[PDB]
């Protein structure tokens, strides 16, 4: 699944939320998040996101797997 990290923080809007075939981009405190368990590993968002700030959950550094687990948290519990 393609999940948030860090470079998106407070950086612009749009060009991700509108593209997703399963609408699973939702809001966080500052930046948006993505439910990774819903995300069907389609990419797309990948291509439009500047420098792919949306990174695949295991390309995502262990440090930022915290955020993946956060995006999960948000929509699980
Ligand atoms: S990879 Fe596709 S399914 Fe997943 S969040 Fe991005 S646009 Fe949505
Ligand atoms: S920068 Fe953030 S606004 Fe979307 S296009 Fe990337 S997740």
């Amino acid at each position: 699944a393609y999940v948030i990290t860090e470079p998106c923080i407070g950086t612009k809007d749009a060009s991700c939320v509108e593209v997703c075939p399963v609408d699973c981009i939702h809001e966080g405190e500052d930046q948006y998040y993505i439910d990774p368990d819903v995300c069907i590993d389609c990419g797309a968002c990948e291509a439009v996101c500047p420098v792919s700030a949306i990174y695949h959950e295991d390309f995502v550094p262990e440090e930022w797997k915290s955020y993946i687990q956060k995006n999960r948290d948000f929509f699980k519990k």
Side-chain angles (χ1 to χ4, degrees), residues 1-2 16 19-25 34-35 38-46 54:
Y2 281 83
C16 58
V19 310
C20 179
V22 293
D23 303 82
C24 75
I25 289 58
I34 297 110
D35 187 287
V38 167
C39 170
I40 61 109
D41 270 307
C42 93
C45 63
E46 176 183 50
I54 292 168

Side-chain angles (χ1 to χ4, degrees), residues 8 12-16 49-50 54:
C8 174
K12 77 151 193 68
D13 179 23
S15 77
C16 58
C49 186
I54 292 168

